Amino acid sequence: MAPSRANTKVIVVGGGGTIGSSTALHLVRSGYTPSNVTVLDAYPIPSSQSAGNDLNKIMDADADPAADAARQMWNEDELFKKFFHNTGRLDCAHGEKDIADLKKRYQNLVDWGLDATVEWLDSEDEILKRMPQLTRDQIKGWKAIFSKDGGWLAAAKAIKAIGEYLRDQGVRFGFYGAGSFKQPLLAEGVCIGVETVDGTRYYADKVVLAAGAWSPTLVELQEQCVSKAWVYGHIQLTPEEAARYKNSPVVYNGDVGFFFEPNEHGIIKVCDEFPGFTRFKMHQPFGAKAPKRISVPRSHAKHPTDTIPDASIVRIRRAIATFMPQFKNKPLFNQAMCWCTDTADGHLLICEHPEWKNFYLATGDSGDSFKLLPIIGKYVVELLEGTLADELAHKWRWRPGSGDALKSRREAPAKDLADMPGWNHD
Numbered sequence: 001m002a003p004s005r006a007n008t009k010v011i012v013v014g015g016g017g018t019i020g021s022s023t024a025l026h027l028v029r030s031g032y033t034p035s036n037v038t039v040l041d042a043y044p045i046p047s048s049q050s051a052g053n054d055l056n057k058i059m060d061a062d063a064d065p066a067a068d069a070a071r072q073m074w075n076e077d078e079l080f081k082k083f084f085h086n087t088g089r090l091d092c093a094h095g096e097k098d099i100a101d102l103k104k105r106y107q108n109l110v111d112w113g114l115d116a117t118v119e120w121l122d123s124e125d126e127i128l129k130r131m132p133q134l135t136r137d138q139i140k141g142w143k144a145i146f147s148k149d150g151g152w153l154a155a156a157k158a159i160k161a162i163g164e165y166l167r168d169q170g171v172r173f174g175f176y177g178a179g180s181f182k183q184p185l186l187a188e189g190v191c192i193g194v195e196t197v198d199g200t201r202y203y204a205d206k207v208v209l210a211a212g213a214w215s216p217t218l219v220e221l222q223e224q225c226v227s228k229a230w231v232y233g234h235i236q237l238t239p240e241e242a243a244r245y246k247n248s249p250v251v252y253n254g255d256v257g258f259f260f261e262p263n264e265h266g267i268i269k270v271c272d273e274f275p276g277f278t279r280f281k282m283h284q285p286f287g288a289k290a291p292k293r294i295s296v297p298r299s300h301a302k303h304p305t306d307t308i309p310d311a312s313i314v315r316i317r318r319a320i321a322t323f324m325p326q327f328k329n330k331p332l333f334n335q336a337m338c339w340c341t342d343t344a345d346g347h348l349l350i351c352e353h354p355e356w357k358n359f360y361l362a363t364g365d366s367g368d369s370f371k372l373l374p375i376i377g378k379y380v381v382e383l384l385e386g387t388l389a390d391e392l393a394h395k396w397r398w399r400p401g402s403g404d405a406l407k408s409r410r411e412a413p414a415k416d417l418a419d420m421p422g423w424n425h426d
């Protein structure tokens with residue numbers, strides 16, 4: 001019957017990204033033999049097109065079991081702890097609608113699962129006493145929640161640290177044409193390996209597809225996942241300017257955008273807040289009988305001259321003019337699109353393929369899974385071994401026809417890059 005952990009060969013497709021690197025880590029921590037694990041990625045770990053290849057991501061206070069288990073590891077696991085910056089978060093709102101919603105969010109913590117960590121800031125001057133770097137004339141009528149819990153995650157560094165640990169263990173890697181998945185290798189309905197674009201054939205007992213936004217492009221997912229991009233750009237502070245924002249909280253206003261503490265090189269990343277962009281084109285995933293119109297990521301790693309739409313730049317410039325008016329003349333550089341894939345309900349897609357035995361999906365990240373990096377591979381290993389909790393097996397199940405992922409649980413259906421000029425410089 002089935003091999004032991006030490007004798008099981010596993011291929012992790014997308015193992016240079018978030019879910020895939022975590023899966024490879026948890027296979028080695030679980031006592032799989034490192035040389036029996038093969039990481040395949042289009043790009044070397046940390047993949048240059050991974051959504052986790054970022055200077056920073058937010059760590060919030062999500063009460064979910066996966067998020068809580070990840071939070072404990074960001075605080076306690078020596079591989080990850082140094083990459084969690086506990087700056088806290090300043091969530092601001094203005095206008096009657098946004099303030100009323102913020103006030104209810106705050107009350108839902110008092111009423112329910114404790115505040116302790118959280119403060120209501122009921123005026124401009126209370127926001128300024130927390131964050132003196134803001135400008136009063138730009139925050140007229142604002143209120144905020146200040147949370148001391150959470151902060152930001154040094155995302156690319158964390159995936160790089162997993163990759164170094166995996167290399168030092170003796171995990172096997174294939175990248176570029178030797179890593180770019182083309183198709184599963186099927187033998188009478190059982191997946192026994194993968195073929196890459198260069199024609200290399202890798203054989204294993206189990207295959208994990210952790211290909212992020214590329215997952216519905218690579219195999220037929222029946223629109224369960226729809227891929228979308230979000231945007232950012234960067235500004236460079238002088239050492240004196242950057243020292244003002246040492247340990248600064250993540251600052252967010254849902255009408256405006258958000259920005260992070262400068263990194264150790266003085267760079268602040270600034271983001272819009274919006275429902276994402278698709279990039280529909282004709283493509284034929286493995287298991288599709290003909291080409292289909294699907295959202296296919298427009299990869300900045302493949303197209304490094306790409307930037308972001310003009311509309312996005314206007315929004316990011318508005319966010320800088322509002323949060324950091326003293327920096328409005330700094331150029332916005334290293335502008336990029338970053339891709340995720342939404343399910344209709346925003347829950348993960350972590351399941352065995354219904355026809356291809358031993359081929360597992362680990363995707364549906366839905367734009368909020370970087371914080372799960374330390375833990376998510378544990379659940380994927382449980383899935384491979386048949387021990388995943390039944391409630392999670394159901395929540396993460398194969399579910400075509402379960403709702404429109406174009407809108408997902410977001411405010412609107414995503415707009416398409418074909419309609420949003422300014423990002424293509426070919």
Ligand SMILES: *Cc1cc2c(cc1C)nc1c(=O)[nH]c(=O)nc-1n2C[C@H](O)[C@H](O)[C@H](O)COP(=O)(O)OP(=O)(O)OC[C@H]1O[C@@H](n2cnc3c(N)ncnc32)[C@H](O)[C@@H]1O
Pocket residue numbers: 013014015016017018019020040041042043047048049050051052053057058059179180181182210211212213214218230231232337338339340362363364365366367368369370371372
């Ligand atoms: C884009 C984005 C995401 C994001 C965010 C802001 C932006 C702009 N803010 C976040 C935040 O504050 N907090 C948080 O927890 N998450 C946030 N996110 C979302 C997060 O980045 C994603 O949910 C998560 O990183 C997705 O992980 P996943 O593992 O699913 O995807 P990935 O890291 O992109 O990795 C996919 C890998 O697949 C490889 N690939 C693609 N095609 C192939 C082929 N053909 N063969 C082999 N490998 C392939 C990619 O190269 C990549 O490494």
